Amino acid sequence: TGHKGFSYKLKLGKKIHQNRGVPQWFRMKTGNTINYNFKRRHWNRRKMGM
Amino acid sequence: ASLKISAIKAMSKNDMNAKLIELKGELANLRTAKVTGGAPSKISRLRVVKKDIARLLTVMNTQRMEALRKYYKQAKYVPKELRPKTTRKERRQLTKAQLNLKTVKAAKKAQHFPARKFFVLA
Amino acid sequence: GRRTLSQRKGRGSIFKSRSHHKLGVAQHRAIDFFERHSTVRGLVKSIEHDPGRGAPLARVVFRNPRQYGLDKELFICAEGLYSGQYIYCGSKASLHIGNVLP
Amino acid sequence: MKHNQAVSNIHFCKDWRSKVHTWFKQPFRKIRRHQTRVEKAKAVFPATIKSLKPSVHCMNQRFNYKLRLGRGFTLKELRAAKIDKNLARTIGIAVDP
Amino acid sequence: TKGTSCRGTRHNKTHILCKRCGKRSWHLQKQRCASCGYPDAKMRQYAWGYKALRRRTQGTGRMRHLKIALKR
Amino acid sequence: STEAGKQHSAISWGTGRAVARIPRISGSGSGRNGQGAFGNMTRKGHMFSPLKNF
RNA sequence: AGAUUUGAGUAUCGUAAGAGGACUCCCUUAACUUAAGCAUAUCAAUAAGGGAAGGAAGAAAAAAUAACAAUGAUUUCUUAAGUAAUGGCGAAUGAAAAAGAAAAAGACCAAGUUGAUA
RNA sequence: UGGAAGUAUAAAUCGAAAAGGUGAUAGUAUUCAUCAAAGUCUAAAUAUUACAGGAAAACUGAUAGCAAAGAAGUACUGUGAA
RNA sequence: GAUUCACGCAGUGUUAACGUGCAAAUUACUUGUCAUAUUUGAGUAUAGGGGCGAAAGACUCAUCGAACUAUCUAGUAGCUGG
RNA sequence: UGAAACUGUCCUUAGUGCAGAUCUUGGUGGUAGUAGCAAAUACUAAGAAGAGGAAAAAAACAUCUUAGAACUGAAGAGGAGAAAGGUUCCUAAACAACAUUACUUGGAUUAGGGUGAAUCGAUCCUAAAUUACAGAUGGAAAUCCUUAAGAAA
RNA sequence: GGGAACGGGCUUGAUUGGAACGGCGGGGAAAGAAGACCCUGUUGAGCUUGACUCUAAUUUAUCAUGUGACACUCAUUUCGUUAAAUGUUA
RNA sequence: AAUAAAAUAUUACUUUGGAUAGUUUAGUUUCCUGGGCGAUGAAGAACGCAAUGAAUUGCGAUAAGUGAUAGGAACAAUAAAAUGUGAAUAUCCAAAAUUUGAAUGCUUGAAAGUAUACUAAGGUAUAUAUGAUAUUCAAUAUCCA
């Protein structure tokens, strides 16, 4: 909704921040196994349920 | 980081107060430089000034609380921050003097009939 | 078996009284000295329709016996009562329609 | 049941699996008690004596011809032996009024 | 119409986020949390929910103070 | 472990659904839900008589 | 007016709360199951619910056993013993003394007495 | 409760004492034996699959062993408990 | 709490379409109804031997002649399969 | 072929031998290049961009502009809000996957940008109703009471 | 034909060229579902009823000590108020 | 009668798939030592903090870390700056310790807020129950002028 509580909006912003991939420099670390973030979601694929 | 704790300890309270303002003001400028495409030298400097502020505040606070412990060392009512570190259970237990306290009748019995040292011949 | 409708009526969830637009509680005024041993006068200001009951209710206004102010009452209207009428409550009240007597 | 056998009386119809006690700590009770005995041997040194116990007869006619260690000497046995009952407990003698 | 059609009017939340446990388990009309048992002072735990006990209990979080007291 | 393989609320679906009568993992949303359950022959279920430490 | 009694507000110094509950002390009248049915019984101080604790807890110093050539607080182990007993005397349930060991330790209140009483 | 003409607890009524309780077949009588209830504390020997730190193993070896040998109670499902 | 048409809604018939569908109940035409015992949103109240029901054992989150979920529980099976 | 462990004999031990359990888990065939990609009237010409209309008509060609031809027909396939969603909004680069052909298009990929209130709302007031201290009740969990029970409000 | 009494397979015959496209609805006792009709379990559940055995609610009797010889109030019950002239004199 | 396109059969090579073999920073069980939380604000939850981070880890406005004590030359994916005038690293220590949560001035839905007192802001304190002491009271409740 347009109308929302202040703390609810900040939890919406955090979910936007966490919907990002692994940076390139992190993928070049030695002994690295983290290439894709599996905690990723999209608005039309999975509803975050909050 | 470059602030040299020995040099921090050489300043007075007023000098240590003004240094924090100078460090805080410098850190504010470097934060502006980071978002305006600053050089890597300026960004590396910004991490140094961040630790100097933490270092300066550590000496300010440690020197202040050491003076408060001396102030309340003999005081009857000591603030709960300066009391010795204990668990909640420890503050509830009886004092060792109170645990081994004995009645007047029992005190003299242990004085006139103590556990003797002996041995049996075989 | 199940619970009959007469049993479900005693819990009072959807069977509570629909008493939202009711005027109030219709009753005499609290008995005091001035009505045990004297008479008080009340003016019938208006006659209203109390929802959920078939009889009209009268808004009677007694002045006050002991303090300064008003005493707004709510009687069950007797047949023949009219607006602006003076009614009397007390032991020595006359035997007229609308008066409240022992 | 088939053929000749005894009538079986096994009380396993309850939950015995939570009533099972295993003795895997038996080899380490021996070490724990023996070590505590040795530290008991010091501290109270000498004479970690387990207190002198009386000679009493076992109860019932099934055992009454045998002697065994009782608990504590009676006041008359201490008086007969000329021992103060207050000092007796401090020199490793068990007392049982 | 009890299947696909009746799901069109589902736009009112029964539960929102809880302040104490952080789960979307705060019943709005009941005014209590179905997961942590909010305003009730004690945290809601049941012996038949053995998995729910190992999902949120001591040691499942940061242990900010107790990680120092025990090691001391 | 005494609870190894027995940590589900699984029940058999019964007949009439074209699948065997072994208990099935309840719920939905994962690959585990609707799979086999405690049975000795099933994957991730308890084995034949579990070896007791007594 | 003064001497008490009881009950309040405030200030000061403290105390309880919540987590955990494997082991510990309790409350509450489950059923599946077994009895080849089932209703007492069994499952069973069992599950779930509820309260309280500690590094251990509980218990502990005889209004106790016994009938002996007598023992002697409590706890725990061995044996007694699937025994005595209970039970649609069916299915089933079921101890304790004696005896052998680990460890051992006994102390106070009340009441009584002393009152230039403290 | 094994406790069987009542082993223990509780409730309703009743209710002691110039003491008395027990000796498990109810009753009364006389002996005998042994204790002396209706307040409190008490180390040690004992238990432990919480949790933490260690050591072992005729145990498993990636469909096995904990559900989890990787950001595992994670991804994902449900309004929610789960 | 008259008769009708329209916006809407329903579901009389075709026992039409579809029936591994647009759809775990929809589509088309025909038909009916289309404001006072009317329609509808949000808030709120009522909970499982319970609720709610102009009453069909109907509805209570695709679950109802007793919801869902977890524990007792690997319930028992003289019966079927290996 | 494979590159770091293994075998023979005697005893001991067992989570010890599979074709079946609508068995469990995983992988894979025939069906089969098959059924289908047929509601919502509809597209065409020139040009541009692009690797992407070629050619013995391979008869069909996504995006943008213009011209033609059309549909929803103002109780709309128009312009805005509440709930719900949560960045899907805007721009640029880029098209591996996704939208039952393809896509240079996109609600898709990557990176940035974007939400400005004394006057709009929330905040404030009360409605149906809801929940506290003390009190009443209960073995317990807890239940009741909402101004009545209170030196409270 | 016989066979578990209605064979694609077995026996004896009729007969046969390999790969298939479009249709079609005879057969595959075609697919979907551990028959829902019937019976058997010493298997259930909903509902009914002087089926057996119980139970909430209701009801009756006894016990639970207010005074004075029916009368009173003093516990107790149900109320009303801003606890706002109650009772006896004047 | 005839062809071997399809079909069938065996081997080699390749492919789809991930069995088998070798391996293990992970489990399971038994035992030993403790069993050391909280109004001095716990466990849990949320948010935030790295030069380039989304998760995870560590930490709390002094932020992937500060002081002190040990420790002695690294880190690295890339670039910086610092460094024997002391880099990493370790800790029962010191300082500091956001919003909540028993949550405790009042309110709390996803709520933004707000009162008083002490020391414009900032920081403290103010829930309920309860023990002791002090002080101010109330009730002719008992005496009592």
TrEMBL record, chain A:
<dbReference type="Pfam" id="PF00832">
    <property type="entry name" value="Ribosomal_L39"/>
</dbReference>
<comment type="similarity">
    <text>Belongs to the eukaryotic ribosomal protein eL39 family.</text>
</comment>
<dbReference type="GO" id="GO:0022625">
    <property type="term" value="C:cytosolic large ribosomal subunit"/>
</dbReference>
<protein>
    <submittedName>
        <fullName>Ribosomal protein L39, putative</fullName>
    </submittedName>
</protein>
<dbReference type="InterPro" id="IPR023626">
    <property type="entry name" value="Ribosomal_eL39_dom_sf"/>
</dbReference>
<dbReference type="InterPro" id="IPR000077">
    <property type="entry name" value="Ribosomal_eL39"/>
</dbReference>
<keyword id="KW-0689">Ribosomal protein</keyword>
<keyword id="KW-0687">Ribonucleoprotein</keyword>
<dbReference type="GO" id="GO:0003735">
    <property type="term" value="F:structural constituent of ribosome"/>
</dbReference>
<dbReference type="GO" id="GO:0006412">
    <property type="term" value="P:translation"/>
</dbReference>
UniProtKB/TrEMBL annotation, chain D:
<protein>
    <submittedName>
        <fullName>60S ribosomal protein L13, putative</fullName>
    </submittedName>
</protein>
<comment type="similarity">
    <text>Belongs to the eukaryotic ribosomal protein eL13 family.</text>
</comment>
TrEMBL record, chain E:
<dbReference type="InterPro" id="IPR011331">
    <property type="entry name" value="Ribosomal_eL37/eL43"/>
</dbReference>
<dbReference type="GO" id="GO:0003735">
    <property type="term" value="F:structural constituent of ribosome"/>
</dbReference>
<keyword id="KW-0694">RNA-binding</keyword>
<dbReference type="GO" id="GO:0022625">
    <property type="term" value="C:cytosolic large ribosomal subunit"/>
</dbReference>
<dbReference type="Pfam" id="PF01907">
    <property type="entry name" value="Ribosomal_L37e"/>
</dbReference>
<dbReference type="GO" id="GO:0006412">
    <property type="term" value="P:translation"/>
</dbReference>
<dbReference type="InterPro" id="IPR001569">
    <property type="entry name" value="Ribosomal_eL37"/>
</dbReference>
<keyword id="KW-0689">Ribosomal protein</keyword>
<dbReference type="InterPro" id="IPR011332">
    <property type="entry name" value="Ribosomal_zn-bd"/>
</dbReference>
<keyword id="KW-0863">Zinc-finger</keyword>
<dbReference type="GO" id="GO:0003723">
    <property type="term" value="F:RNA binding"/>
</dbReference>
<keyword id="KW-0862">Zinc</keyword>
UniProtKB/TrEMBL annotation, chain F:
<feature type="compositionally biased region" description="Gly residues">
    <location>
        <begin position="28"/>
        <end position="37"/>
    </location>
</feature>
<protein>
    <recommendedName>
        <fullName>Large ribosomal subunit protein uL4</fullName>
    </recommendedName>
</protein>
<comment type="similarity">
    <text>Belongs to the universal ribosomal protein uL4 family.</text>
</comment>
<feature type="region of interest" description="Disordered">
    <location>
        <begin position="23"/>
        <end position="42"/>
    </location>
</feature>
